[PDB]
Design a protein around this ligand. Structure first.
Ligand code: AGS
Ligand code: MG
Ligand code: ZN
Length: 1424
């Protein structure tokens, strides 16, 4: 109670001295002299900081000393402390000092804010920043209509201005929930006991309330409840726990011989009380009396089995909130004991009547208050989560009462509960389909016919309210022709010209909306003068004045004169120009308060509703920040510091939408222009001009990154207006060239860049340190552009631009050197590839064969020698520049694949080996880790010498292993232990590889003997465990004790060995001090099923946590390892791109550690169940629990196996018949696993994105064998994990009964996506992933070329593997596969080049085609 007392006493200090002395000495006794007490030390530490005043100086000093013990606080620790204090809040006004301190901490450190955002990337839902934002919003909500409303609102707006519109990667707002409450609820296993606990907790909380009338009712109810047998059982269960409610309720609990018994009274007709229509449907007002009367009627008349409910009448009579809380429990209790469904029918009829009355529009009964609607929605939501007496399924449990869920969904949408509205719409659609089967556009028109509500329109409205961008595409197609929908689509896609044309053309649209859209489109197109003249013409609604003020402050007119937002901003800027600082600060404070109040008045359902308010608050905060700079004398250091702060906080907004970043940049530009105008000092004016030029260049770059062209041109024009140029060399001219190039005006950009190059060459010989970077960048960009447009021959481009750029060229200089080296290497590689393609082409061989049938031969020999010399020169240049590029940076690290491919192919070339030995060894070792498998498989002992390939490769492998033993030791040892399986139980290339691996192992052991010995022992134990026969316990499923003779049990405390199946973060330094190490193995091991019966074991590490590992014998895991490497590279590519990073598109991966030719170990995914196990299980499959009257999976499999020998027509007919009697059921996974609508929506969206990404990535890699048992779904995250990666690169199409689908997109997979199916989120995510794949075709091609040519990678289909799957020619096969992959990446399908959307449309229609699905193998289970 200390915090409550302190918060109450703090305001009383200012009242008067007479009470000030008493309050001060009481507080001093509370905190000052009590610091010795250990019990209250934590309570004092977790307390609100005292207000900063002279009176509180000693208290503040003591509080700071106590809190900041054991070290200082970081930003994350400060926010955690703020939230922990916020756990208990008596009043919002007591949090003002904490809010100010939090704002100061946030504004002081933003690099720590970047670190926090990076750390929270893995689990965005548990992000600290979004939690802080929602906590602040809730605090501001609680401050409405109180004494300190404006003070709290201003502080909340001040702190929210610091964070700004950061992309939180969340869509659903998760309100804070008590952890102890959930655990206490979990403790009780009986329904009646939980009601008792909840009611007693509510009464205990009510006891503290001020009203004396409610206290008597609360104590009476407590005494009545605790006397009964249910109360005694509750106390017996709950006395073991630790909670102050136990101590508070001790006096009321009494011991009596007989438990208090409630006299059960039964009327002649219990249904007469609740049969009144007026009772259920209230008026517009009088909600409290309505809910009280309904609760009394339920309690007095309806017979309730539970004794606790009957004792709640005195508490229900006084408090309305108690009635609202208890009504669902009363309804559930009455429905539990219902017989003959009389109560069910009556309640269903009355509730449906209430919901229909809510949907009118006055009428006789309509326009009900939102409180009653929310109460009924809470009743429905509570009933949805309760298991029905007849058991059944969650879908069955939804219909406790016969309800038309479309009306309920519409009411929920009207109440701003969008996620539950979508869930109820889905439930209604499913119920309508189920009912129709007994006897969207069709469903929409039917629902409009009977219920008067269109399903498609409701779904569109709900998805618009949610704010998810991708979902809006798949809503429907009924109203696409309407101008309003087209205009909304144009605005969403930033097609401002189309939106402007449509707004001008359509006149049926209301004038206000039409003019607002016209003004917004004109502003977004950069037509500022046209917009101003148009507004002047309109002079012949508040929104019009709002747009007037926005245009006025954006155009700096300064003449166009409840206050709104842009009006406040314009007034603040005008007063800032007029040096009226008081009005400036007052207007900014008023704008803060108004924006925060408007934000907190909303229901706060989705995160996307917070971004505009955050952007506006950030703009206001920046204006207030520059206010003090304008107030005092302007210095260069202050301007540099404020620009650095702006750049950091813009870096915080990297992934934010352009619609939120743009107003901030516009305000910054106006700010800088005003500051330059009001300078009157040449020395500072130059610095202000430089700052404005840098800001405008950054704005141009930002607008170009979002495919915007008018804004960069306007920014360049402003730069020209201010930064008048006569020297003719500057970075903004390079930015102008880039802008012109972005507009597809290549001639102008090339002319500008060549003029800049000639001016730079004439001015100096690249001797100015400031202009060196600009010269190098101009040369490199011009060379790349000329190469792209083919306007110059390769010789001129190489000699004039790229080689010169390298020769011209301190972090910026290092980055420029890296970029120039990469460009030169890429051009040289292009020339080398062109010359090699010509040498390997059929035209060259035909020309050679023509002369095969005398000076012609001499000329041919001379030409061949010249071609070979040119090829070698290009190769050497490319390799050298790649090596130099890898040295000077880390951004282009994935080019190590191309470098290693070039080195490996030309092994015999001494120059390449020489430059790899001299400068290649200086490359950091961690950059070779992704290619460790190939580099280790390529090593041998044949070419031994000073510049021999094998010697250099062995040295590189040894250095990599020395620097990163944890990442490479297992691979090398597995190379050495290829044939140790037979030795443990009882070709020249292979033996050379074994010898090289043994040599590297000997070197590492000479460096680290103990680690090598322990790793060898662990590998031997794993191999011995794998070879153990497990057919004895094949039927066993409860776990089997490992035999004592197994060496694995003996191993203990291996502190030099890290858990092999645990992913390890790459460390540039070679310390690796703090890593989890293997401690012991649990005695029991389980079986996962399958032909070979793999064993699952548990490995407890240094900490208490343990990891499950899958030990596989008689199986090859190297293919899985390399496929996981490909998946990691694709994940890096996806995370690098902004569009795929925003959607969190990733490929789930699991670490695989091969041990021998046929032995290995891999990480076992926890919480993942196979989709086939969930769907078509014989015992408790989803197809059996739901739709039990349909065909069983056994019948479908039998029919499809029987129709195997018949023709294609018979197969198609049988497949259609099976699909008719086998409906999808997979949509219930998220419905039954996640009961909260927001969590359900998030998990379903994650599932859809995972399906899209996995499908696209698998198609790019030609992934096959994607049956039900090879796909797992995580129960916690609802994401799919693809396993058994043996078949890839379209080798499944060579099988008998070839696979004719790019990926698995069967009816269950699409059904899991929701009512929209493949439309909406899935299609757009597939398009984004395919676009990312297209943009990185060269990197993927290099990676796959390195992988395929790996000697140890067995990826070609063979007759033995073909027979097992369904119960040199290698060079040309690999070339054909690479060409097919290149065609896929470029988009060439069957000789026709397609766009990303067209290719995605083709893939989807090929995957979902029943014609292709019918011809597939019956084991693939296409019907599932
Ligand atoms: N990483 C993993 N996480 C979880 N379960 C896995 C994992 N890898 C394999 N399993 C399961 O282990 C069992 C057998 O795995 P597989 O590698 O597919 O064996 P198999 O040689 O393919 O024989 P099958 O599956 O009967 S054709 C299946 O039940 C898989 O779901
Ligand atoms: Mg399998
Ligand atoms: Zn009305």
């Amino acid at each position: 109670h200390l915090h409550v007392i302190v918060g109450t006493l703090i305001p009383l200090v200012y009242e008067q001295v007479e009470v000030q002395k008493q309050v001060l000495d009481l507080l001093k006794y509370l905190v000052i002299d009590n610091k010795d007490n250990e019990n209250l030390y934590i309570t004092i530490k977790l307390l609100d900081p005292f207000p900063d005043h002279v009176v509180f100086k000693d208290l503040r000093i003591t509080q700071q000393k106590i809190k900041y013990s054991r070290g200082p606080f970081s930003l994350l620790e400060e926010i955690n402390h703020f939230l922990s204090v916020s756990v208990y809040d008596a009043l919002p006004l007591t949090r003002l000092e904490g809010l100010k301190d939090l704002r100061r901490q946030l504004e002081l450190h933003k690099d720590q804010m970047v670190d926090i955002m990076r750390a929270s990337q893995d689990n965005p839902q548990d992000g600290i920043m979004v939690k802080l934002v929602v906590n602040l919003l809730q605090l501001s909500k609680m401050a409405i209509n109180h004494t300190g409303e404006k003070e709290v609102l201003e502080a909340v707006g001040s702190c929210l201005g610091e964070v700004g519109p950061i992309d939180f990667s969340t869509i659903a707002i998760q309100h804070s929930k008590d952890a102890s409450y959930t655990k206490a609820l979990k403790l009780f296993e009986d329904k009646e006991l939980q009601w008792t606990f909840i009611m007693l907790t509510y009464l205990n909380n009510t006891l503290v309330e001020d009203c004396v009338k409610v206290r008597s009712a609360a104590v009476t109810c407590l005494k009545n409840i605790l006397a009964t047998k249910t109360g005694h059982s509750f106390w017996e269960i709950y006395k073991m726990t630790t909670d102050p409610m136990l101590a508070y309720l001790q006096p009321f609990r009494t011991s009596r011989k007989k438990f208090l018994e409630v006299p059960r009274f039964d009327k002649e007709n219990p249904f007469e009380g609740l049969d009144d229509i007026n009772l259920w449907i209230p008026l517009s007002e009088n909600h409290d009396i309505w809910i009280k009367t309904l609760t009394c009627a339920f309690l007095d008349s309806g017979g309730t089995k539970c004794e606790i409910l009957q004792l709640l009448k005195p508490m229900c009579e006084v408090k309305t909130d108690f009635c609202q809380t208890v009504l669902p429990y009363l309804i559930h209790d009455i429905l539990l004991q219902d017989t003959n469904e009389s109560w069910r029918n009556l309640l269903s009829t009355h509730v449906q009547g209430f919901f229909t009355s809510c949907l009118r529009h006055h009428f006789f009964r309509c326009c009900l208050d939102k409180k009653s609607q929310r109460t009924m929605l809470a009743v429905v939501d509570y009933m949805r989560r309760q298991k029905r007496p007849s058991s059944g399924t969650i879908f069955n449990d939804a219909f406790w009462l016969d309800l038309n869920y479309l009306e309920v969904a519409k009411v929920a949408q009207s109440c701003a509960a969008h996620f539950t509205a979508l869930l109820y719409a889905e439930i209604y659609a499913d119920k309508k389909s189920m009912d129709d089967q007994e006897k969207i556009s069709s469903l929409s028109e039917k629902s409009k016919e009977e219920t008067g509500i269109s399903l498609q329109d409701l779904l569109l409205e709900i998805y618009r309210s949610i704010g998810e961008p991708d979902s809006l595409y798949g809503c429907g197609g009924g109203k696409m022709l309407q101008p309003i929908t087209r205009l909304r689509t144009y605005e969403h896609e930033a097609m401002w010209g189309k939106a402007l044309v449509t707004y001008d053309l359509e006149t049926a649209i209301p004038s206000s909306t039409r003019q607002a859209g016209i003004i917004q489109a004109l502003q977004n197109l950069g037509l500022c003068h046209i917009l101003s003249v148009y507004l002047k013409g309109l002079d012949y609604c508040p929104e019009l004045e709002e747009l007037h003020y926005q245009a006025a402050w954006r155009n700096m007119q300064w003449d166009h004169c409840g206050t709104s937002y842009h009006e406040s901003l314009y007034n603040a800027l005008q007063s800032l120009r007029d040096r009226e600082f008081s009005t400036f600060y007052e207007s900014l404070k008023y704008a803060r308060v108004k924006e925060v109040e408007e934000m907190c008045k909303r229901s706060l359902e989705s995160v996307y509703s917070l971004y505009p308010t955050l952007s506006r608050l950030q703009a206001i905060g920046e204006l207030e920040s520059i206010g003090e700079l304008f107030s005092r004398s302007v210095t260069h250091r202050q301007l540099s510091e404020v620009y650095i702060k702006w750049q950091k906080h813009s870096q915080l907004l990297k992934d934010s939408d352009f619609s939120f970043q743009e107003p901030i940049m516009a305000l910054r530009t106006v700010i800088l222009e005003i500051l330059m105008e009001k300078e009157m000092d040449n020395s500072q004016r130059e610095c202000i001009k430089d700052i404005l030029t840098k800001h405008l260049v950054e704005l141009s770059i930002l607008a170009r990154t979002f495919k915007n062209t008018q804004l960069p041109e306007r920014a360049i024009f402003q730069i020209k207006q201010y930064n008048s140029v006569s020297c003719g060399v500057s970075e903004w001219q390079l930015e102008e060239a880039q802008v012109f190039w972005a507009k597809k005006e290549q001639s102008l950009a090339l002319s500008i860049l060549k003029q800049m190059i000639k001016k730079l060459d004439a001015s100096c010989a690249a001797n100015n340190p400031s202009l060196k970077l600009t010269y190098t960048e101009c040369l490199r960009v011009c060379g790349n552009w000329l190469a792209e447009t083919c306007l110059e021959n390769p010789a001129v481009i190489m000699q004039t631009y790229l080689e010169k750029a390298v020769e011209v060229a301190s972090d910026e200089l290092r980055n420029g050197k890296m970029k120039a080296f990469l460009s030169l290497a890429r051009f040289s590689d292009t020339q080398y590839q062109r010359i090699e393609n010509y040498m390997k082409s059929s035209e060259f061989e035909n020309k050679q064969a023509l002369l095969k049938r005398q000076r012609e031969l001499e000329l041919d020999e001379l030409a061949l020698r010249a071609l070979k010399e040119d090829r070698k020169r290009f190769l050497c240049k490319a390799v050298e520049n790649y090596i130099n590029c890898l040295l000077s940076g880390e951004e282009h690290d994935m080019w190590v694949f191309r470098l290693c491919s070039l080195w490996l192919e030309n092994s015999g070339v001494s120059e390449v080996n020489g430059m790899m030995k001299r400068d290649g060894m200086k490359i950091p070792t961690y950059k070779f880790l992704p290619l460790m498998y190939q580099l280790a498989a390529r090593m041998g002992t044949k070419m031994m010498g000073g510049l021999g390939f094998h010697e250099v490769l062995n040295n590189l492998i040894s250095r990599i292993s020395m620097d990163h033993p944890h990442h490479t030791l297992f691979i090398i040892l597995a190379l050495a232990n290829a044939n140790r399986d037979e030795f443990l139980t009882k070709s020249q290339l292979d033996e050379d590889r074994t010898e090289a691996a043994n040599r590297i192992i000997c070197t590492i052991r000479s460096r680290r003997p103990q680690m090598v010995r322990s790793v060898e022992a662990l590998c031997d134990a794993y191999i011995i465990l794998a070879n153990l026969d497990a057919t004895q316990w094949k039927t066993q499923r409860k776990g089997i004790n490992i035999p004592a003779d197994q060496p694995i049990t003996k191993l203990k405390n291996l502190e030099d060995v890290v858990v092999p199946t645990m992913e390890i973060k790459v460390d540039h330094t070679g310390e690796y001090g703090n890593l989890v190490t293997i401690q012991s193995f649990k005695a029991e091991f389980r079986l996962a099923g399958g032909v070979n019966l793999p064993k699952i074991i548990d490995c407890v590490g240094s900490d208490g946590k343990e990891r499950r590992q899958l030990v596989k014998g008689r199986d090859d895991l190297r293919q899985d390892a390399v496929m996981q490497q490909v998946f990691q590279m694709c994940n890096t590519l996806l995370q690098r791109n902004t569009e795929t990073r925003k959607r969190k598109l990733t490929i789930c991966t699991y670490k695989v550690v091969p041990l021998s030719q046929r032995s290995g170990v891999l990480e076992w995914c926890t919480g993942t169940v196979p989709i086939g196990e969930f769907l078509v299980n014989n015992e408790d499959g989803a197809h059996k629990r739901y739709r039990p009257n349909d065909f069983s999976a056994f019948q479908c499999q039998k029919k499809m196996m029987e129709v195997q020998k018949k023709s294609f027509e018979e197969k198609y007919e049988v497949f259609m018949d099976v699909c008719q009697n086998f409906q999808p059921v997979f949509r219930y996974f998220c419905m039954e696993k996640f009961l909260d609508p927001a969590i359900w929506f998030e998990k379903r969206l994650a599932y859809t994105r995972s399906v899209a990404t996995s499908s696209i990535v698998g198609y790019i890699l030609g992934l096959g064998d994607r049956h039900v048992q090879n796909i797992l779904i995580n129960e916690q995250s609802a994401e799919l994990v693809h396993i058994d990666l043996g078949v890839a690169f379209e080798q499944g199409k060579i099988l008998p009964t070839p696979e004719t689908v790019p990926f698995r997109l069967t009816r269950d997979i699409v059904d899991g996506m929701g009512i929209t199916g493949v439309e909406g989120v899935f299609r757009r995510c597939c398009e984004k992933t395919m676009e990312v794949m297209r943009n990185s075709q060269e990197t993927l091609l290099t990676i796959v070329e390195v992988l395929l040519y790996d000697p140890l990678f067995d990826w070609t289909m063979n007759p033995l593997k073909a027979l097992y799957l369904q119960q040199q020619s290698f060079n040309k096969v690999a070339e054909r596969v690479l060409m097919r992959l290149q065609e896929k990446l470029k988009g060439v399908e069957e000789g026709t080049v397609l766009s990303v959307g067209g290719q995605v449309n083709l893939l989807i229609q090929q995957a979902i085609d029943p014609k292709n699905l019918s011809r597939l193998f019956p084991g693939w289970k296409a019907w599932v």
